[PDB]
Scaffold this motif. Structure first.
Motif, PDB file in Angstrom:
ATOM      1  N   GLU C  55       0.756  -1.264  -0.147  1.00 47.09           N
ATOM      2  CA  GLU C  55       0.034  -0.006   0.138  1.00 47.09           C
ATOM      3  C   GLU C  55       0.863   1.269   0.226  1.00 47.09           C
ATOM      4  N   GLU C  56       1.668   1.201   0.848  1.00 49.27           N
ATOM      5  CA  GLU C  56       2.573   2.428   1.020  1.00 49.27           C
ATOM      6  C   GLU C  56       3.615   2.666  -0.304  1.00 49.27           C
ATOM      7  N   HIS C  57       4.037   1.608  -0.659  1.00 48.99           N
ATOM      8  CA  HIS C  57       4.672   1.766  -2.290  1.00 48.99           C
ATOM      9  C   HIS C  57       3.675   2.059  -3.479  1.00 48.99           C
ATOM     10  N   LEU C  58       2.744   1.691  -3.418  1.00 43.56           N
ATOM     11  CA  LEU C  58       1.598   2.155  -4.333  1.00 43.56           C
ATOM     12  C   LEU C  58       1.514   3.527  -4.387  1.00 43.56           C
ATOM     13  N   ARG C  59       1.023   3.937  -3.052  1.00 42.07           N
ATOM     14  CA  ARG C  59       0.979   5.269  -2.703  1.00 42.07           C
ATOM     15  C   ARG C  59       2.007   6.147  -3.078  1.00 42.07           C
ATOM     16  N   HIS C  60       3.145   5.920  -2.962  1.00 46.06           N
ATOM     17  CA  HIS C  60       4.297   6.650  -3.549  1.00 46.06           C
ATOM     18  C   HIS C  60       4.618   6.679  -4.915  1.00 46.06           C
TER      19      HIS C  60
ATOM     20  N   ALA D  63      -1.359   7.010 -15.057  1.00 46.23           N
ATOM     21  CA  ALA D  63      -1.356   7.947 -16.461  1.00 46.23           C
ATOM     22  C   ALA D  63      -2.469   8.935 -15.872  1.00 46.23           C
ATOM     23  N   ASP D  64      -3.293   8.761 -15.015  1.00 49.35           N
ATOM     24  CA  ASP D  64      -4.262  10.078 -14.647  1.00 49.35           C
ATOM     25  C   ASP D  64      -3.893  10.578 -13.585  1.00 49.35           C
ATOM     26  N   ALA D  65      -2.781  10.365 -12.555  1.00 43.94           N
ATOM     27  CA  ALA D  65      -2.524  10.804 -11.337  1.00 43.94           C
ATOM     28  C   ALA D  65      -2.550  12.313 -11.148  1.00 43.94           C
ATOM     29  N   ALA D  66      -1.675  12.930 -12.335  1.00 43.25           N
ATOM     30  CA  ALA D  66      -1.668  14.530 -12.174  1.00 43.25           C
ATOM     31  C   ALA D  66      -3.056  15.152 -12.196  1.00 43.25           C
ATOM     32  N   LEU D  67      -4.072  14.391 -12.698  1.00 45.49           N
ATOM     33  CA  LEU D  67      -5.466  14.998 -12.690  1.00 45.49           C
ATOM     34  C   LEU D  67      -6.255  14.941 -11.456  1.00 45.49           C
ATOM     35  N   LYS D  68      -5.737  13.846 -10.523  1.00 47.10           N
ATOM     36  CA  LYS D  68      -6.809  13.261  -9.702  1.00 47.10           C
ATOM     37  C   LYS D  68      -6.628  14.325  -8.369  1.00 47.10           C
ATOM     38  N   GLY D  69      -5.661  14.431  -7.887  1.00 49.53           N
ATOM     39  CA  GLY D  69      -5.489  15.057  -6.451  1.00 49.53           C
ATOM     40  C   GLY D  69      -5.045  13.929  -5.387  1.00 49.53           C
ATOM     41  N   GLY D  70      -4.646  14.463  -4.331  1.00 46.30           N
ATOM     42  CA  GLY D  70      -3.946  13.443  -3.335  1.00 46.30           C
ATOM     43  C   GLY D  70      -5.141  12.726  -2.581  1.00 46.30           C
ATOM     44  N   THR D  71      -6.191  13.107  -2.579  1.00 46.12           N
ATOM     45  CA  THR D  71      -7.303  12.459  -1.890  1.00 46.12           C
ATOM     46  C   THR D  71      -8.005  11.242  -2.681  1.00 46.12           C
ATOM     47  N   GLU D  72      -7.901  11.443  -3.871  1.00 44.67           N
ATOM     48  CA  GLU D  72      -8.594  10.508  -4.841  1.00 44.67           C
ATOM     49  C   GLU D  72      -7.607   9.414  -5.254  1.00 44.67           C
ATOM     50  N   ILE D  73      -6.225   9.786  -5.213  1.00 48.80           N
ATOM     51  CA  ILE D  73      -5.021   8.929  -5.312  1.00 48.80           C
ATOM     52  C   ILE D  73      -4.992   7.858  -4.077  1.00 48.80           C
ATOM     53  N   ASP D  74      -5.132   8.360  -2.949  1.00 54.46           N
ATOM     54  CA  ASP D  74      -5.161   7.646  -1.654  1.00 54.46           C
ATOM     55  C   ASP D  74      -6.253   6.614  -1.719  1.00 54.46           C
ATOM     56  N   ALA D  75      -7.398   7.218  -1.971  1.00 60.17           N
ATOM     57  CA  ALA D  75      -8.696   6.272  -2.123  1.00 60.17           C
ATOM     58  C   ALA D  75      -8.532   5.269  -3.149  1.00 60.17           C
ATOM     59  N   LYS D  76      -7.948   5.587  -4.385  1.00 62.66           N
ATOM     60  CA  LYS D  76      -7.733   4.533  -5.358  1.00 62.66           C
ATOM     61  C   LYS D  76      -6.793   3.221  -4.770  1.00 62.66           C
ATOM     62  N   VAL D  77      -5.989   3.983  -4.296  1.00 63.66           N
ATOM     63  CA  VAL D  77      -4.782   3.006  -3.965  1.00 63.66           C
ATOM     64  C   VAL D  77      -5.177   2.084  -2.656  1.00 63.66           C
ATOM     65  N   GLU D  78      -5.835   2.638  -1.870  1.00 68.08           N
ATOM     66  CA  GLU D  78      -6.488   1.683  -0.554  1.00 68.08           C
ATOM     67  C   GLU D  78      -7.498   0.687  -1.111  1.00 68.08           C
ATOM     68  N   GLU D  79      -8.202   1.075  -2.270  1.00 65.94           N
ATOM     69  CA  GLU D  79      -9.225   0.275  -2.956  1.00 65.94           C
ATOM     70  C   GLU D  79      -8.229  -0.766  -3.464  1.00 65.94           C
ATOM     71  N   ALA D  80      -7.282  -0.620  -4.144  1.00 63.41           N
ATOM     72  CA  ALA D  80      -6.630  -1.640  -5.009  1.00 63.41           C
ATOM     73  C   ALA D  80      -5.868  -2.617  -4.015  1.00 63.41           C
ATOM     74  N   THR D  81      -5.224  -2.004  -3.141  1.00 61.19           N
ATOM     75  CA  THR D  81      -4.692  -2.688  -1.834  1.00 61.19           C
ATOM     76  C   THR D  81      -5.878  -3.713  -1.403  1.00 61.19           C
ATOM     77  N   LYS D  82      -7.183  -3.136  -0.925  1.00 59.20           N
ATOM     78  CA  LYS D  82      -7.912  -4.361  -0.582  1.00 59.20           C
ATOM     79  C   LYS D  82      -8.373  -5.472  -1.423  1.00 59.20           C
ATOM     80  N   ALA D  83      -8.507  -5.044  -2.860  1.00 56.72           N
ATOM     81  CA  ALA D  83      -8.699  -6.065  -3.799  1.00 56.72           C
ATOM     82  C   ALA D  83      -7.648  -7.002  -3.719  1.00 56.72           C
ATOM     83  N   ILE D  84      -6.197  -6.558  -3.416  1.00 59.37           N
ATOM     84  CA  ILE D  84      -5.057  -7.237  -3.718  1.00 59.37           C
ATOM     85  C   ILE D  84      -5.248  -8.432  -2.359  1.00 59.37           C
ATOM     86  N   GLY D  85      -5.559  -7.582  -1.224  1.00 59.44           N
ATOM     87  CA  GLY D  85      -5.747  -8.678   0.022  1.00 59.44           C
ATOM     88  C   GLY D  85      -6.603  -9.493  -0.189  1.00 59.44           C
TER      89      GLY D  85
END
Lengths: 90, 90, 90, 90
Positions: C55-60, D63-85
């Motif tokens: 999670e931390e690495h993908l955030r980075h 690809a879309d990271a510069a358009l999204k903002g920090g909050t939305e990036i964090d939420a997408k990465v949290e969601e992907a991490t959960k799917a990975i879990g």
């Protein structure tokens, strides 16, 4: 055996249902996380199916153990353990 | 039983070595993908240890069913199958 | 980075505790199913540790793609995906 | 996107093929270990499919990271991490 067979087929019908579902999701450009959730459900169902077949096999090895001899018991248990290893690697 | 015990302990010494290695990696700010590679190595060694214990127990169960007859060892088969299911989730 | 490091080290201390627990279990001839339950607990804790690092690495990675632009961080995505694949086998 | 879509559908066609194979094996009373081998192959294929979708998703987040903002990036990465879990638990 007939009851177990019917139950196994019913489990696999469900699973094929899930896979058809996955194709429809991909076809309809469903969000990828929702697809991953359904993939995980289908893998879980396959694992549960595998465990049921393993349990039934081990029960049979128990039922027949006094007829088999030490060599054949060892070979059956080595084989089951290998199948369990392969299951673990998914 | 005494030789298998020695071999179980040696496996676990090596696993503890791997975990100390993870600690030093974290402590030394090693790149996280290298750390994950070592986590995989450790989980693989744990699974290999589990499979050894499982093989030996299933050998005992089926050998005991041969010596005693009947299907009472089926309880032990179900308990083993539940253990495998738990390993498969983790 | 310093707080996350502390939290990574505490996770790994607890995992090493679990492995020492397995050693004592084996040493004390604890019933093998109980031992497997503890192996599952340890592999689960390792996977939880892996997911935190991931999670931390993908955030980075995604935050860095925002700061720098372009798709060069795709190499890091592929490397992470390969790491996940390795975790999934083990 | 169209090429990736076609490739995903082709992977799922294969998998449904495998599941149909499993039904035929059960129907024909094929030895349970041979069935387990095919179950493991089908689970592996599903996992490989899941990883391909995850990689593609992570690439898009890059690809879309510069358009999204920090909050939305964090939420997408949290969601992907959960799917990975959830993927890891199969």
């Amino acid at each position: 055996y007939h009851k177990q067979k019917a139950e196994h087929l019913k489990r696999l019908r469900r699973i094929e249902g899930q896979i058809r579902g996955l194709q429809r999701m991909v076809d309809e450009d469903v969000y990828c996380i929702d697809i991953l959730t359904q993939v995980s459900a289908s893998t879980k169902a396959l694992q549960s199916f595998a465990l049921q077949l393993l349990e039934e096999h081990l029960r049979h090895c128990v039922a027949d153990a006094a007829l088999k001899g030490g060599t054949e018991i060892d070979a059956k248990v080595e084989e089951a353990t290998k199948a369990i290893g392969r299951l673990l690697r998914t």
